[PDB]
Structure 1
Amino acid sequence: GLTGTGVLTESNKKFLPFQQFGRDIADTTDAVRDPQTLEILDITPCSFG
């Protein structure tokens, strides 16, 4: 249900078991646990300035 736009790239982190979303200092979306293949892949912005 979380929609967004960007570039998908593999990375790693750790989550507490009852946690799914991890925010940023700027309160954007940093980290998410993939539902089908249970990994911790995250997102990076697409536009370049």
Structure 2
Amino acid sequence: GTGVLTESNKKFLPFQQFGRDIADTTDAVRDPQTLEILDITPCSFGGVSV
């Protein structure tokens, strides 16, 4: 996917690797290389009106 990767304060239990939002879309992940909790936020967007 495409988004902004940041550190996340949400604590994952040791078995947990993925996090999901209300919309059932992946919102957080654990990096395969180093076990760390990272949340994904979509890149900035907004309607444009002239």
TM-score if structure 2 supplies the norm length? 0.70
Q: Aligned pairs, how many?
A: 45
Instruction: For residue 41 of structure 1, report the CA deviation from its aligned partner.
Output: 1.3
Runs of 5+ in structure 1 lacking a partner? none
Runs of 5+ in structure 2 lacking a partner? 46-50
TM-score if structure 1 supplies the norm length? 0.71
Structure 1 stretches of 4+ moved >3 Å: none
Residue identity over aligned pairs, in percent, reads 100
- Aligned CA-pair RMSD: 1.3
Pick the structure with more strand per residue.
Answer: 2
